[PDB]
């Protein structure tokens, strides 16, 4: 639109309480099933086997005179045990668990800014004794 206010439409990102500003937002929804290819036949089969596990991909930026301290605090939070509550900017609140967080940081090429590539997974508990 012509007067689309961006930061009043995307939710502020935050994982496990620690807030940060995101620069991207992806997802990998789906649904998994079989595919039957009977021999010598002009026919095909399909059988829906469930729900495909979701995964989210984000990219955080830290552009402040104290981006090193913020990056280190973010690293300490991401490596805290167990899944946590994530606020995806375009999908709202989910329960996710971190899977990888690459922290790129040059000095004589781009000093001041730090980018972090995050990869989360939908994480639900079960119980303990298989249901």
């Amino acid at each position: 639109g012509p007067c689309y206010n961006p930061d009043a439409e995307y939710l502020p990102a935050s994982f496990k309480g620690f807030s940060f500003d995101a620069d991207s937002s992806d997802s990998d929804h789906g649904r998994n099933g079989a595919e039957a290819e009977f021999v010598f036949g002009e026919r095909t089969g399909y059988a829906d086997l469930g729900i495909k596990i979701k995964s989210y991909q984000l990219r955080a930026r830290f552009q402040t005179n104290d981006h090193i301290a913020q990056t280190n605090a973010f690293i300490a939070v991401l490596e805290s045990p167990g899944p946590g509550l994530l606020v995806h900017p375009t999908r709202g609140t989910v329960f996710a668990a971190c899977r990888s967080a690459r922290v790129t940081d040059s000095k004589v090429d781009a000093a001041g800014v730090t980018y972090v590539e995050l990869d989360f997974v939908e994480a639900n508990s079960v119980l303990s004794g298989f249901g």
Binding site: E37, F38, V39, F40
Partner: protein
């Protein structure tokens, strides 16, 4: 093709005992023996496969020749995989000059396989041309 030499035997001696009615002593304990030979193997690889019923001369020689065909048929095993898919006892002429086969062989086995992607092939196991 694999014609090994650890499963061959020159002389097969069949011994046993006579189980007929009335026959006792020597004629049922001593005489029954037979020594069949496969004049293809080579050096003296002897053997003794003993018999387990009414050991007649014909019975002895016949068990002997049975095993002398088993060991023979195992000493040249030719597995071939052919393309498209009647040979459980069929004989065929086979020509594989590089391994020196120019002979008429009997298919012991037959396996048809399929899988919608890349298959339809038949695996034959054949019988030696002594």
């Amino acid at each position: 093709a694999e014609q090994s030499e650890d499963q061959a035997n020159s002389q097969i001696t069949v011994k046993g005992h006579r189980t007929q009615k009335g026959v006792w002593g020597n004629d049922a304990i001593v005489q029954p023996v037979q020594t069949v030979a496969d004049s293809w193997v080579g050096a003296n690889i002897p053997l003794t496969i003993q018999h387990y019923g009414d050991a007649t001369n014909e019975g002895l020689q016949r068990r002997a020749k049975f095993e002398a065909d088993r060991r023979a048929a195992e000493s040249k095993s030719v597995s071939v995989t052919v393309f498209h898919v009647w040979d459980i006892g069929t004989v065929h002429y086979v020509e594989i000059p590089p391994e020196g086969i120019f002979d008429v062989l009997e298919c012991v086995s037959l396996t048809y396989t399929v899988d919608a992607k890349s298959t339809l092939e038949t695996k034959l196991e054949l019988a030696p041309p002594p």
